[PDB]
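Final report, results section. Input specification for complex C-07:
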Amino acid sequence: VLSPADKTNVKAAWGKVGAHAGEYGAEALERMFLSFPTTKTYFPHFDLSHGSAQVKGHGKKVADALTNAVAHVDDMPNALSALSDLHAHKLRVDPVNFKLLSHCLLVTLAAHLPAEFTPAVHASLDKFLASVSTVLTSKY
Amino acid sequence: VLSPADKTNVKAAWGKVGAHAGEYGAEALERMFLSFPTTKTYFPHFDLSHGSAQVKGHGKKVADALTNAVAHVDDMPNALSALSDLHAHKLRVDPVNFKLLSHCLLVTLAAHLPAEFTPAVHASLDKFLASVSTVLTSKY
Amino acid sequence: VHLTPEEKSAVTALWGKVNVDEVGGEALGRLLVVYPWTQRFFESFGDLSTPDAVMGNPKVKAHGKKVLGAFSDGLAHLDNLKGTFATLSELHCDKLHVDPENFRLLGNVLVCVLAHHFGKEFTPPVQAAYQKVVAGVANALAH
Amino acid sequence: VHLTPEEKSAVTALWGKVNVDEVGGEALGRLLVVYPWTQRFFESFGDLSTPDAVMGNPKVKAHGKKVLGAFSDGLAHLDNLKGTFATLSELHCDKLHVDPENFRLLGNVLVCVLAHHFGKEFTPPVQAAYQKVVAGVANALAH
Ligand code: HEM
Ligand code: HEM
Ligand code: HEM
Ligand code: HEM
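Structure output:
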């Protein structure tokens, strides 16, 4: 459950992220693939090398999903219903992988926005990514 | 996030639990203390022996809270607010301990209701206890 | 796993009354039902949509018999769990890519199944010794 | 922890540019802020209500210097992590009752702090090497 203060923090942080979302998501996916090779088994049809166009496109898709989740923070379960059905019913992704991807997104945000990544902003982003991860792993 | 089906399953299961809630909660607390001794550090003022009146009373309170959560499944954050502030702000309990207590409650329910503990009922109770644990581990 | 003589005697006595052919499959099916993401590893077992189809699966039953036989082999070598579960650890880590938390989940499901099948006989101390046994098994597998 | 020569060279070079006196305390403060249940352990330190009070605590800064010094001692003995962190593991398991997941959380917070301080030169390979290093440290502490 999120408060108003951290919701405002995530909204401001992602608004300041802005148009770099696609490259940030691609870099986060690359970091997840490089540091957690077990997650590579979920993408056997992808080319998982550095600078891959498929990874860049999937990162752009993930970034757009994060942007619309930020826009719909108060009503996540039904705003991300298609993704929840994709990840839980079809893909059957372990929530550990969601935790790893959230950690890699946090690392990317820290490495790209030092002034933006305050300790309060870090906590707000952490629990926002936990809320997106729980919605996408929920099966209902 | 819970579906209507597992919500109905938990409602029926706890309605059939009924008046044995206090004994079941006391036994669950005893099981948690015996199998996970690290949780005993959260109760330094209690007498944690077998058949203890303090443990029986605390189990009765926990069972009453669980019954209230069952009666208020759709609005847990607003129904368990006092307990959320108690466990998250004052007590500051690790969610691992909540997971252990949920597992011990599941073991107690399995040992006391064979006919009631169907595999679907088990899944519904697991998700219900995860939802109560998440509400009591969140900060507002 | 370090256990008292009383705990070891209690664990072995409960294990003798264990109906492996049923309880192993029951534990595997309950894992698949309560934690549906585990069906990714068992998609080759056929129909796993409904709990009744999961519990009526001969492949699930046979795999549960094999998982329980490993649990019995580990119980017979409680002082050598790491060496007993080395080939299985390699198979689960390098070949199957199973997350170690799933081992703890399966151990908890097995404990719940034992409680369901034994009732009052599965007392809080017996549950504690069994929890130590399944934690040791999970740690040996995750190595 | 097994590392390639390139990974070890990258890890050691970044560690030399690390400001211990700052980043150890900042990592501890970020752990306390993002995971507030960890303040149960740090109650002696004093005011830990607001993030600005957590990050401006001399006791938190000193304890973060000690935690980073242990991380440096572990980095200097990457092939003997289990034997290096034996006393710390005993202290954290028997005297402090700290859950092992908190070690992984602190390692992730430290990695985030390193990323925040090193920006672009914290490449994904460096992050992977540091992730497996902190994972080995957490495993040595949890033993
Ligand atoms: C944590 C936040 C996540 C978000 C916001 C997210 C979002 C998305 C989006 C937008 C798609 C595109 C679906 C489509 O184009 O049809 C997708 C697909 C997919 N996701 Fe995620 N995802 C997340 C986590 C994960 C994780 C951690 C994994 C695996 C470790 C994963 C595995 C997949 C896979 C395998 C696909 C299929 C892509 C394809 O077939 O091209 N997801 N996700
Ligand atoms: C579903 C899970 C839980 C429920 C429904 C629950 C419910 C309750 C209730 C009703 C009380 C009584 C508060 C009062 O009388 O003022 C309480 C107190 C308390 N709870 Fe929990 N609790 C849960 C989990 C836990 C766990 C896992 C722990 C520790 C490992 C814990 C630690 C405590 C402590 C230390 C108290 C104070 C009791 C006292 O001071 O007498 N709670 N909880
Ligand atoms: C204490 C926990 C576990 C034990 C003792 C155990 C034991 C075993 C055993 C005895 C086998 C048979 C290997 C063979 O016949 O060569 C096996 C295979 C396998 N295990 Fe496990 N296992 C455990 C946990 C898990 C979990 C939790 C999963 C998945 C979520 C899993 C996935 C698999 C799969 C997919 C196979 C191969 C099945 C097949 O090829 O038909 N294991 N395991
Ligand atoms: C994960 C890597 C960790 C490292 C390298 C580490 C390192 C250390 C060291 C070197 C000490 C000795 C301090 C002294 O002798 O004065 C210490 C003490 C302590 N540790 Fe850790 N620690 C870690 C994780 C944690 C975590 C995650 C927590 C709590 C959530 C924790 C709680 C404590 C506490 C409470 C003390 C005693 C502080 C005091 O008495 O003032 N440790 N740690």
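The first helix of chain D runs from residue 5 to 16. Residues D 38, 41, 44, 63, 66-67, 70-71, 88, 92, 96, 98, 102-103, 106-107, 137-138, 141 surround protoporphyrin IX containing FE (ligand 4) (CB under 6 Å). This concludes the modelling results for the funded period.
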